[PDB]
Amino acid sequence: KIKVKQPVVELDGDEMTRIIWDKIKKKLILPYLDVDLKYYDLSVESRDATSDKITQDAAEAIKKYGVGIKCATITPDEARVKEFNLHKMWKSPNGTIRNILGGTVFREPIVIPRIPRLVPRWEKPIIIGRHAHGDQYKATDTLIPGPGSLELVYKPSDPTTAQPQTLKVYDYKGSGVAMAMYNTDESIEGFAHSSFKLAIDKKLNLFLSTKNTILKKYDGRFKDIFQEVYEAQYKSKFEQLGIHYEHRLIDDMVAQMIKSKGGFIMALKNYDGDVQSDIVAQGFGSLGLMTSILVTPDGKTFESEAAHGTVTRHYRKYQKGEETSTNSIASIFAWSRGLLKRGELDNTPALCKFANILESATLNTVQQDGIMTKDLALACGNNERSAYVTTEEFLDAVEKRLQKEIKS
219 in a labelled binding site: no
What letter would DSSP give residue 299? Answer: S
Residues sharing a CB contact under 8 Å with residue 194, sequence separation 6 or more, in sequence order? 103, 104, 106, 129, 295, 296, 297
370 in a labelled binding site: no
Site residues (CB under 8 A) for its own copies, limited to 142-161: 142-158, 161
Residue (227 or 364) nearer to its own copies, CB: 227
Instruction: Give the CA angle between residues 317, 322, 325 to the nearest 5°.
Output: 75
Site residues (CB under 8 A) for its own copies, limited to 64-93: 75, 77, 89, 92
Site residues (CB under 8 A) for its own copies, limited to 178-197: 178-188
349 sits near its own copies (criterion: CB under 8 A): no
Q: Which of 95, 125, 299, 370 binds its own copies (CB under 8 A)?
A: 95
Residue (169 or 406) nearer to its own copies, CB: 169
Q: How far is the CB of 79 from its own copies (least distance, A)?
A: 11
With contacts defined by CB under 8 A, how many residues of the chain interact with its own copies?
Answer: 86
Residue (119 or 206) nearer to its own copies, CB: 119
Residue (66 or 190) nearer to its own copies, CB: 190
Q: How far is the CB of 248 from its own copies (least distance, A)?
A: 12
Gap between the Cα atoms of 257 and 198, Å rounded? 19
Gap between the Cα atoms of 168 and 152, Å rounded? 7
Q: How far is the CB of 204 from its own copies (least distance, A)?
A: 21
298 sits near its own copies (criterion: CB under 8 A): no
Gap between the Cα atoms of 335 and 358, Å rounded? 10
345 sits near its own copies (criterion: CB under 8 A): no
The one segment of 214-222, 232-240, 318-326, 381-389 that binds its own copies by CB under 8 A:
214-222
Nearest one of 342, 338, 302 to 97, comparing CA atoms: 302
> Within 13 Å of residue 250, how many CA atoms lie on the same side as its CB?
16
Site residues (CB under 8 A) for its own copies, limited to 240-269: 250-252, 254-256, 258-259
Nearest one of 8, 42, 95, 43 to 301, comparing CA atoms: 8
Residue 11 phi, psi (nearest 5): -115, 110
251 in a labelled binding site: yes
Q: What is the DSSP string of 384-407?
A: SGGGS--HHHHHHHHHHHHHHHHH
Annotated binding site for Mn(2+): 251, 274
